[PDB]
Subunit: 467 residues, 4 copies
C-alpha cells in the first residue's frame, strides 16, 4: 500500500477490513481477464489516459476492480460509485479504497444513499471535480450530470456506456437534442452484447437463484419474459438445469428463435392481449409457474394481475437493469413482506398488516426486484467481463484522445454522436478471449483471404454481419 | 396434355410428389399465408422468373406460390445432387417447365440452366431471376447480357451467392439490382443455422448409419452454418471441436462449450506436411466443412485423418475439400449413391477388406441435400416467404423500364425491411402454436417502438 | 453356387449388402473380437440355430459370427418391416438359409418362421434358438414341441421376449433353459436406451422430413426405451412430455427435465371420452409409445389428438396403438411405404386436401426399424456380443443331453455373469478410443474388488 | 434452561426456522410421512443417535423423527457441512445437537461423543442413523455394550454401506442395518441429481469461475460421477471422464464424454513417468467422485495446469493427496474453504505467483463444504427413506430378540420396492406430475398389480 496516500479518507465503503480478501480475489481475477490485462501490459508505458479524470458508475464488483485498476495503470484518475444498490461486493470496494482510489459503494444502499454516492464522485471537497470523462452503466450518472451539473459537461470529452438500457437513454437524448457530449455504445460490441448479455446471464442467473433459495430447479416450470440477449442467456441458465422453460416475447423474430431453440412461446395474457383486467390473465398458465424472470428493459412486464395469479410459492425475479419490470409497488402496498435473509423476501398474499409464519400462500421475491444476478450472487464471472471491460478501456482511450471538449463549436456539431467501436478492435478483444481458453485460431492463406475478399488480419465480416 | 417442356428423371413419380407437396403446404404457414393474401391481387402477373435452386419438395411449394401469384417460371436445380425426383415430377406434371434430376453430371447441370434461359431455341422473355449460389446470375452476365437489359432484379438465396453479387457490384459489372434474401433474420438465423442442425446428422445417418455419440468431430467454420452443424453433432453426443479464422466466431464457440483447434500447428497453414497437427487429425472420426471458402480440408489434412473417418461438406460448393487430390491419388469404391470409400492405399484398385479408407459423402457436394432432403419444410417456410416478398418488391419496382439516370440510382444489393422480416417470423411462430404478446401503448412508448413494430433498430443482431 | 434354400426380395442386392457388412464389421469391435478369439476353437461346431431377429446389416454380422464359430443357422426376421433387403440378400448369397424381406404380410411372416423350422418339409435337427420377442419360441412350444426335446437353450434379445419366457417359467410350460440377453448392462442400458436415442428421430425424419424443434411430443413410457426416445426428441428441440405408470420412472423423467402428464384426467383411464384430457392431446404434434403394454395410445386418444399429429410405436408389438380402430373407422392414404395419412373424416374415401388426418408410421410397428435402419452397428455390437457368448454358454451346457434329474436343476432363465458384461463393455470403450484406468493393488483392496473385476456387486444398477 | 447442545451461534435460530419452513414446502414425501404418522407415534420409545451433515434438510428430517415420537442426539458427519442456522434452529427447539461449520478433527470426534454420552454416561440409545459410518465405527470399537441394546442402523451413503458390508463379511457387525443409499429414490436421485445441482453451485460460490469453454476431468462415473459430469457439461465445460469400471466407462462414452486416464495406458505404477502430462497440463478443473483412495495423487497434482481447481465430492478427503500438498507447498487462504496451493515451495509465496492450484473445502465434500449440499426437494427422497427405515428397524426390535433369532436377522437389507415407489409418487406429485393408472387388463397384460410394484427386483432403471 505504498502508493496509497497517507491519511486517505476520500471514500465510503462497508468495511475496510475486507480489503486483503478483495485484493486476493482481484489477483485471481487478473488471471481470468487476459484481454484487459493485455491492454494493461501493452499500454501502461504509453500512459494513454494520463490527464484523464473519469467519473465511473458501474457495479462495484471484483471485475469492476480490475477495470478500475487498468484505467489507473494507464494514467487515469477516477472517482467511482456503483450503479445499483445491491450489486457491490464489499470486499472489492474495500480493496479499491485501500488502494487510494475514491469509491463510494456498499451492498445494501438505500435509494438516498445511492444518490449520495454518485454525488460524492461528482464533488471533491464540496465542489465539482474537474472531470473530463464518464464511464456509465445504465445512464444514471449521465442523467445526473445533464440535469444537475450541466456546466461540468463543458469539460467532458465523452461517455462510454456499458448496457442496453443506458444506450437507449443516450439515443433518446441524441434524438431530442439534449445529449451534450459524444458517447461510445460499448454494449453493442459483439464481445460485449453477445458475450456478457447472453453468456453472463447463463452463468449467473441460476447461480443467484440457488444462493438465494437453494431451490432445486430441475423438473419445475419457469416463465422467462423476453428473449433478447439477456432472455436468451437466462432461458439457457434455467433449461440447462432441467427446468421446463416457457418464453414470452413481443418481438416475433426473437420468438421464432425461442421456438427453434426448443421453448414453448406463451403469453401471460389470453391471445397476447394485455387489456389491464384480471380476466385477461391466463390463470391456468400462471398457476403452474414456479419461477418468473423478467429480462426486457421494459416497464411492468410482470404486473399486479400476473403476481396475483402466480402459483403459490413461486419465485419472482428480474435480471433487466431496472426494478420497474415487476410491479413491486403493488406488493408493498397490498401484501406483507417477511425477510428470509438479505435480498430474499417472502411476500404473503393473505393481506398487508401481518402474516402467519406457516402461511403457504406467498411468493419469494429476490433482490427486491433489482438485478438478481448481482443482487443475490456476484453477477457475471471475470472471464466474461474481460470482454466488456476491454471494450470499455478502448472506448475510454478513443474518446479521451479525440478531446471533444476542446473542439470549436463547429467541430463539436460534427462529432456529437453515439458510435460503436470498429470491428477490428472487437476481433482483437475476441482473439485474446479465445487464447485465454487455449483456443487456436487458424490463419487464412493469402489465396483463401482473396477468395472470400478479406485481409489475412481481418476484419473477417462486413459490418452488417449478425453472428 | 401435350406438355413436353421439361426434363425430369421419372414423370411417374408425380403423384407421390403431389402427396408430399400437400403435406409441405401444411408445414409452411408463412408461404401459404402469402398465397392466401395475394392470390386475388395477382401481384406477379406478367412476371417471368428464371429460377435456379435445389428442386426439392420445399422448392415446389415456393414455385407453386409464385405461379399462384401470377408468375410464369422456368426452373432448374442449383446442385447436381439436391433434386428430389418426386418434387421435379410433380412440378413438370403441373405444366411448369423444370429441368432437374438427382445425379446430374456437370454437363447436364449446365444444360438444365440453359433450358430455362432458352425456350424453343431463343432467349425466353424473362424479367426476373431467383437464384441460390449465383450460377444462373453468372451465366446471364457472361453469356446473355441482352436478356439482363429486360430483367428487373435478382433475388439471391444464399451466403455464397450474395458474396458473388457484392463482388460484381464492387467491380461495376452487376447489371440489375438484387435482394439479399439470405440476410433476413428469418433466413440467415433460421435456415442457415437451424436447417443445418436438423439436416446434417440426418444426412450422415442416411449415408452411413454410423453412431455419432462418443465419437470425435471437427467442424471447420462457426458462422451460421457452422453453428448449426456443430449443434447437430453435439446434440447427438459427439465430442465436437471447432476451427475458425474469425476470433469473434471462435469466442462464441468457446462460450458454447466447444474446444477451438486448428488443423495446423499454431494455426499456420504454410503448405507443408510438417504444419499439420497429425496427432489431432488422427483422432477425428468426422470432418464437416461449413465455410464458403476454398480448400479448408486440404490434401495434407486428408492424408492425416484417422482411418475410416467420414468427410463431408455443407457449404455451397465442393471446393471446400480437395476432392481433386483424392481423385488423382486414391481408389474410389461406391458404397451406394452419394457414398464413396476412398482407399488411401493407391489409385488403381483396392482390397475389398482394406482398413485404410475415408468415407466421402455426396462427392463433397452439399451433404444435407445430397444424402438427405436438405432443410425441413417448416424452416424453408421462412426462407421462401422472404423469396416471394423479394420477388414482389423487385417486380413492382420495374427497374428494367426506368431511364438510365434512374437505374444508376437504384442499382444496389439490398435486404428486405425489418417489418417484413417480423411478419414472416410471426407466421412461423403461430405455426408452432406460439403466442406473441402485444405491447401496451405505454410499453411501446417506453421502449421507443410502435405497437405493431418494428421492434428493434436495424443495427440489432439477435 | 446353386443355393436355393432362401427367400429374399432381390438377391442382386447382395454386393451392396456385402459392402455395408464390411463397414459394419469395423463398427462392431466386441463382436469381431469374439469372431477372432473363437474362430479357431469352433465352439459352435455342431450347433444348429434357429434365429428370429430383424434381418438388418447388424444381424448379418451376428449371423456370420455364429457361422464363423462353427454353427449352422436358419434365419427369419422378427418383424414384417424391419429387414434390410440388401442384408438379407448378402446372407442368402453366402449360402445361409434366410427367409426375410421388408414389407411382409402377417401370413408371410409366419411362413418365413416356418421355413427356418422345416427343412425339405421335415423339422430341421435344430438344437439352439436365438429369438427377439418370443414368436419363434412360442411357435416351437405350441406347434413343434417334439423339436424342443433336442434344443439346448434359447437366447432371448428383448424385454418383451423375456417377459414371455418368465411367464412360461412361472406356469411350468418352458421346455428348455434360456439366457436373458436383454438384461446385460451392455444390452439394456446401451441398445434399449441409446439405440432408441439414435434411431427414433432418424426414423421420423426419413418418414416425414418434419422439423421437430419447437413442436410438442408425448412419450408414453419412461423405461429404457422411453428414456432413449425422450432424449432423441429433446435433443432435437422438441418440448417433450412423458407419461408413466411407474412412479420411480416418472421421478426420473421429472429430474431429467420433462413434464410428467397423463392422457387421462387425474390419470384414470375409465374407457370414456370424458376421461381424455382433450386440451392436452389437442396440443400434441407427435406421440411415441415405448411401453411393451397394450392399448396405451387408445381410440379416444387418437380422436382427441391435434390435427396432423404423427403417431408411432417403438415398443416390440403394434398393439400399443389401437390401429384396428383406425382401420375400421378412418380412410388410409399411403404417402409412401410405411407412411400413411389416416383421415378422420370417415371411412369411405377422403378429400386429397383434407386437413383432419394423422400420420401413422410403419403401420404402428417398431418405427426405428420400420422407417429407418434400427440401431447403429456400434450399439448393436454390445447386444450381439452378448448373444454370441450366450449361445456358446448354453450350447456347451448340452441341456438336451442331460438326465432328467439334472434337467430340473438347470431349467431356468438366467443372465450372463457380470465379468462378461464388463469384458464386452471394455471392447466397446476401446472402440471409441477410450482408456480405462487400472486399479492399484492398494486401491482394489480399499474398495474390496479384484484388480481384474468385477467392479460392482450384482445389486448395482448403474 | 436447555443447555444440552453446542452450536456456533444460537442467535441464528430464527433465520434457520424461516429456512426450515421453506424446506418443509419443498419436501412433500417427508412431510407426507410426518402428517401421516405423527398421531400414531411409531417412534415413541426410539432414542436415535444421528450423525449426518447438519443442514436445513437434516433439520426437517430430525423434526420429523421427533414428531413421530423419537428422541435424538445429533452431530454432523463432516467438519465443514453444517449450516450454522440449521444447527441453531434445532438446538433452540430443545433437541441435543453438537455441530458447527469449521470443526477441527478433534472437535468432530468430541461432537459424536456428546451424542453417545449424556451426563458422562452412555445414553439409553436404541437406534442409529449414520452417513458414512463414523458413528457406527465408534460404537463398534468403543461402546459395544451400547450396541447390545440398539435395534438397527440406517445408513445413508455408499461409503457407509461398504463399511457395513465389510463388518458383515468379517463377522464384526453387531446390529442389522438398512442400506438407505440403494433405494432408487436415494441412489438415483440424491447421488446423481443432487451432485448435478450442487457441484457447479459450490465451484461458483468458491471461485466465481466461468466454467463454459474450460476443460474438466471427472474421476469416476458411478452415480456421483454421472451427476458431477452433467453439472459441468451443462455449464459448457469440455468434460473428460476417468473410470476403472468398463461398464461405467461405456456409459460415459455414449453420454458424449471422452474417456481418458491420468496414466499412460491406464497403468498407475507410482511414477512421474506414468503421468499423461500433456493431458493433465490442459485440465482446468479436476473433481474426484470415487469413494476410493488417492485417485488424485501427488504426481497428478504436480502435472496439473497452472491455476487449476481441485475438489472432491466423494465422502472422504483421502481421494486427493492433500497430505502431500501440506508437506511440500505453501497454502494461502483466499476465504474460508478456498485455498491457493503454491507449487513454488513450502516456506512462503509471492502474492502474485502464477503457479498455484485452488483447492476447495480442503478436499472435503465440496458441495456441502462450499455450498449447501443437495437441495431440499432432492433430499426429500433420501430422508423419507431414512424415516421409513427407522420405523421398520425400530418396530422389529432386534435388540430384544433371543440370540438364535438375532443370528437369523443380522443382515444389511434395502427397503422393499413398494416403499421406494410410494416415495417416488410423492416426489412426482410435488412437481405437479400426473402418474397414469393401469387398467386391469393392462396390469394383467404386463403381469403386475395396478398398485405396483411395477418392476421386478432385478430392474435397474
Ligand atoms: N443483469 C445483467 O447482468 C444484465 C446484462 C446485460 C444487460 N442487462 C439489462 O437487461 C435488459 C435487457 O437487455 P438486452 O440486451 O437483452 O436487450 P434486448 O433488446 O436484446 O432484449 C429485450 C427483449 O425484451 C423484449 N420485450 C420487451 N417488452 C416485452 C414484453 N412486454 N414482453 C415480453 N418481451 C418483451 C424485446 O422484444 C426484446 O427482445 C436491459 O435492461 C439491459 O440493460 C442486464
Ligand atoms: N447446406 C445448406 O443447406 C446451406 C445453408 C445455408 C448456407 N449454406 C452455405 O454454407 C456456407 C457458409 O454459410 P454461412 O451463412 O454460415 O456463412 P458465414 O459467413 O456466416 O460463415 C462462414 C464461416 O467460415 C469461417 N471460415 C472461413 N474460412 C475458414 C477457414 N479457412 N477455416 C475456418 N473457418 C473459416 C468464417 O470465419 C465464417 O465465420 C456458404 O457457402 C453458404 O452459401 C449452405
Ligand atoms: N424398437 C427398439 O429397437 C427396441 C429396443 C429395445 C426394446 N424394445 C421394446 O420396447 C418395449 C419397452 O422396452 P423397455 O426395455 O423400455 O421396457 P421397460 O420395462 O424398461 O419400460 C417400459 C415402461 O413402460 C411403462 N408403462 C407400462 N404401461 C404404461 C402405460 N399404460 N402408460 C405409461 N407407461 C407405461 C412401464 O412403467 C415401464 O417403465 C418392449 O416391447 C421392448 O421389447 C424396442
Ligand atoms: N457429496 C455428496 O453429496 C454425495 C452424495 C452421495 C454419495 N457421495 C459419496 O460419493 C462417493 C461415490 O458414491 P457413488 O454412489 O457414486 O458410488 P459408485 O460406486 O456408484 O461410484 C464410484 C465410481 O468410482 C469408480 N472408481 C473407483 N476407483 C476409481 C479410480 N481409481 N479411478 C476412476 N474411477 C474409479 C468406480 O468404478 C465407480 O463407478 C462415495 O464416497 C459416496 O459415499 C457423496
Ligand atoms: N460482475 C460484474 N461486474 C460489473 N458489471 C457487471 N454486470 C454484470 N455482471 C457484472
Ligand atoms: N429443402 C431445401 N429446399 C431448397 N433449398 C434448400 N436449401 C437447404 N435445404 C433446402
Amino acid at each position: 500500500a505504498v502508493m496509497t496516500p497517507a491519511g486517505f479518507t476520500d471514500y465510503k465503503v462497508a468495511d475496510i477490513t475486507l480489503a486483503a480478501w478483495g485484493r486476493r480475489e482481484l489477483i485471481i481475477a487478473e488471471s481470468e481477464m487476459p484481454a484487459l490485462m493485455g491492454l494493461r501490459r501493452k499500454y501502461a508505458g504509453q500512459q494513454p489516459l494520463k490527464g484523464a479524470k473519469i467519473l465511473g458508475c458501474i457495479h462495484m464488483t471484483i471485475q469492476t476492480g480490475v477495470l478500475i485498476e487498468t484505467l489507473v495503470a494507464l494514467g487515469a484518475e477516477v472517482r467511482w460509485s456503483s450503479c445499483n444498490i445491491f450489486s457491490t461486493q464489499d470486499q472489492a470496494a474495500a480493496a479499491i479504497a485501500a488502494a487510494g482510489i475514491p469509491v463510494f459503494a456498499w451492498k445494501g444502499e438505500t435509494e438516498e444513499e445511492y444518490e449520495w454516492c454518485i454525488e460524492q464522485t461528482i464533488l471533491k471537497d464540496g465542489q465539482p471535480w474537474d472531470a473530463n470523462m464518464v464511464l456509465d452503466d445504465g445512464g444514471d450518472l449521465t442523467e445526473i450530470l445533464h440535469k444537475k451539473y450541466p456546466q461540468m459537461l463543458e469539460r467532458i470529452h465523452g461517455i462510454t456506456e456499458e448496457t442496453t438500457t443506458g444506450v437507449h437513454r443516450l439515443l433518446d437524448m441524441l434524438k431530442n437534442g439534449t445529449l451534450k457530449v459524444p458517447a461510445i455504445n460499448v454494449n453493442d460490441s459483439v464481445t460485449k452484447s453477445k458475450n456478457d448479455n447472453k453468456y453472463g446471464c447463463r452463468h449467473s442467473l441460476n447461480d443467484a437463484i440457488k444462493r438465494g433459495t437453494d431451490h432445486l430447479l430441475s423438473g419445475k416450470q419457469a416463465l422467462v419474459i423476453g428473449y433478447g440477449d439477456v432472455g436468451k442467456g437466462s432461458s439457457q441458465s434455467l433449461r440447462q438445469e432441467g427446468m421446463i422453460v416457457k418464453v414470452a416475447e413481443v418481438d416475433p423474430i426473437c420468438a421464432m428463435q425461442a421456438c427453434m431453440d426448443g421453448f414453448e412461446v406463451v403469453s401471460p395474457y389470453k391471445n397476447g392481449i394485455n387489456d389491464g383486467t384480471e380476466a385477461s390473465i391466463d390463470a391456468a398458465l400462471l398457476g403452474k409457474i414456479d419461477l418468473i424472470v423478467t429480462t426486457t428493459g421494459n416497464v411492468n412486464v410482470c404486473d399486479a394481475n400476473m403476481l396475483k395469479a402466480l402459483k403459490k410459492r413461486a419465485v419472482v425475479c428480474n435480471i433487466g437493469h431496472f426494478d420497474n419490470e415487476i410491479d413491486t409497488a403493488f406488493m408493498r402496498k397490498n401484501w406483507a413482506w417477511e425477510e428470509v435473509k438479505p435480498q430474499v423476501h417472502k411476500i404473503h398474499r393473505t393481506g398487508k398488516d401481518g402474516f402467519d409464519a406457516h402461511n403457504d400462500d406467498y411468493l419469494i421475491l429476490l433482490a427486491e426486484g433489482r438485478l438478481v444476478n448481482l443482487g443475490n450472487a456476484t453477477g457475471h464471472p471475470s472471464r466474461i467481463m474481460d470482454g466488456s471491460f476491454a471494450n470499455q478501456v478502448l472506448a475510454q482511450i478513443h474518446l479521451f484522445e479525440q478531446k471533444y471538449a476542446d473542439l470549436p463549436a463547429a467541430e463539436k456539431a460534427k462529432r456529437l454522436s453515439v458510435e460503436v467501436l470498429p470491428k477490428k478492435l472487437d476481433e482483437e478483444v475476441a482473439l485474446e478471449m479465445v487464447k485465454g481458453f487455449g483456443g487456436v485460431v487458424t490463419q487464412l492463406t493469402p489465396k483463401q483471404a482473396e477468395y472470400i475478399g478479406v485481409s489475412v488480419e481481418g476484419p473477417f465480416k462486413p459490418d452488417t454481419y449478425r453472428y
